[PDB]
Amino acid sequence: KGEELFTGVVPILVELDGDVNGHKFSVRGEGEGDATNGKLTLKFICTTGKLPVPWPTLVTTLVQCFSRYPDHMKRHDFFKSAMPEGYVQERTISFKDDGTYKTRAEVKFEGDTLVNRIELKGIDFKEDGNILGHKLEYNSTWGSPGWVRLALCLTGLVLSLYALHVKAARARDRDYRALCDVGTAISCSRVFSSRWGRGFGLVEHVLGQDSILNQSNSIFGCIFYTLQLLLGCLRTRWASVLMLLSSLVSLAGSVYLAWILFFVLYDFCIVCITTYAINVSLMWLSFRKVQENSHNVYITADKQKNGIKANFKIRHNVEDGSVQLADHYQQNTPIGDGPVLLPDNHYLSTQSVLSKDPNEKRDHMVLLEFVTAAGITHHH
Numbered sequence: 001k002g003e004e005l006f007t008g009v010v011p012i013l014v015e016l017d018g019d020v021n022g023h024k025f026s027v028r029g030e031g032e033g034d035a036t037n038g039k040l041t042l043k044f045i046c047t048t049g050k051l052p053v054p055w056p057t058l059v060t061t062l063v064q065c066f067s068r069y070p071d072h073m074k075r076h077d078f079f080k081s082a083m084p085e086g087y088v089q090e091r092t093i094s095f096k097d098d099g100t101y102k103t104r105a106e107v108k109f110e111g112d113t114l115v116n117r118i119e120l121k122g123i124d125f126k127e128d129g130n131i132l133g134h135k136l137e138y139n140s141t142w143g144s145p146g147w148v149r150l151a152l153c154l155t156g157l158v159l160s161l162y163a164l165h166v167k168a169a170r171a172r173d174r175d176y177r178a179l180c181d182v183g184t185a186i187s188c189s190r191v192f193s194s195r196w197g198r199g200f201g202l203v204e205h206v207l208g209q210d211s212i213l214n215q216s217n218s219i220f221g222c223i224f225y226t227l228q229l230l231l232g233c234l235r236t237r238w239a240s241v242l243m244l245l246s247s248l249v250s251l252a253g254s255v256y257l258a259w260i261l262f263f264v265l266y267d268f269c270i271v272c273i274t275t276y277a278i279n280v281s282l283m284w285l286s287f288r289k290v291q292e293n294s295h296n297v298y299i300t301a302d303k304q305k306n307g308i309k310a311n312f313k314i315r316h317n318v319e320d321g322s323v324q325l326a327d328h329y330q331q332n333t334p335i336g337d338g339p340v341l342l343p344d345n346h347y348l349s350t351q352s353v354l355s356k357d358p359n360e361k362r363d364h365m366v367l368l369e370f371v372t373a374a375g376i377t378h379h380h
């Protein structure tokens with residue numbers, strides 16, 4: 001019956017009393033929620049002055065009853081079924097190599113308003129870590145790619161440019177010797193100028209040799225490493241998936257060319273092995289990156305407490321291009337004694353957009369959120 005209260009837009013009040021390493025603070029948020037579209041719109045203000053932690057670390061703590069459950073999943077919506085009596089949501093949030101938040105909140109209807117009242121205690125944070133030191137990005141669209149990605153892409157670029165220089169000197173001068181041409185046993189310019197050194201050897205078979213796509217592999221390389229470095233500076237999803245696909249094609253071509261270098265050409269190419277290692281590293285970084293941009297809350301039932309349990313990882317962007325992991329363990333227990341929906345295993349998909357209000361001089365955070373339930377299973 002609790003679902004009836006969520007057709008339409010519902011006003012939202014959030015109140016948090018917090019203590020992090022002895023620094024006491026309070027947050028109040030106000031807004032509205034539209035469960036039909038899984039849309040939350042809220043504004044949060046630190047009422048005690050300045051927040052002692054970065055705002056992104058409080059997003060998960062600061063109303064999953066506003067998630068959109070598709071029709072075929074209606075009976076797996078524990079959060080709405082607990083209303084109006086509400087539920088207790090308790091969490092432990094472990095920041096990797098740093099402190100811990102412990103939160104207890106009551107989410108319930110007071111009059112017409114959905115109210116989330118939170119108590120938060122943070123402990124064991126280091127004063128110059130990413131949290132207390134405020135080293136996390138807020139909502140930057142252009143940011144750092146990290147010195148690992150910069151090193152990989154710049155090295156790959158230098159190697160591609162060098163291979164271009166070698167090809168442009170050998171085709172000009174037959175007797176030219178590159179640095180990676182050592183004696184008569186080791187030769188890189190012989191590898192570059194083979195049929196596989198252009199279009200990976202397979203563009204001439206499919207598009208013909210006349211094609212503009214039948215370029216030297218180092219052209220694909222300059223474009224690839226420049227593209228990887230550029231997309232590493234972005235924070236959206238399309239940059240991430242594009243990164244994954246491009247690094248996957250790059251990995252396939254690199255494995256093929258590695259099979260050609262040995263076993264077929266039987267040559268020693270030092271720049272080639274270097275590039276292979278680069279492309280493996282960028283493959284790993286891209287796979288990891290796709291893992292890191294997905295906020296998915298994994299929900300299972302708890303029949304002992306007649307509630308639910310949830311596990312998920314959140315990764316906050318650090319200003320230097322690295323990531324800060326925050327492990328989330330969650331449990332929800334109904335406040336009343338009426339019946340609730342004990343769901344099958346599923347997950348919630350969440351997209352958050354943080355912003356600033358130019359007419360708010362208090363330390364604050366404007367939050368827009370879209371949450372939809374998915375991945376329903378009868379299993380586990």
Ligand SMILES: CC(=O)C[C@@H](c1ccccc1)c1c(O)c2ccccc2oc1=O
Nearest residue numbers: 163196197217254257260261271272275
């Ligand atoms: C290292 C280079 O600059 C060119 C290298 C390469 C490696 C990965 C992806 C594209 C290009 C390269 C070789 O491995 C290679 C190996 C066997 C036969 C031809 C080759 O030519 C290359 O372009």
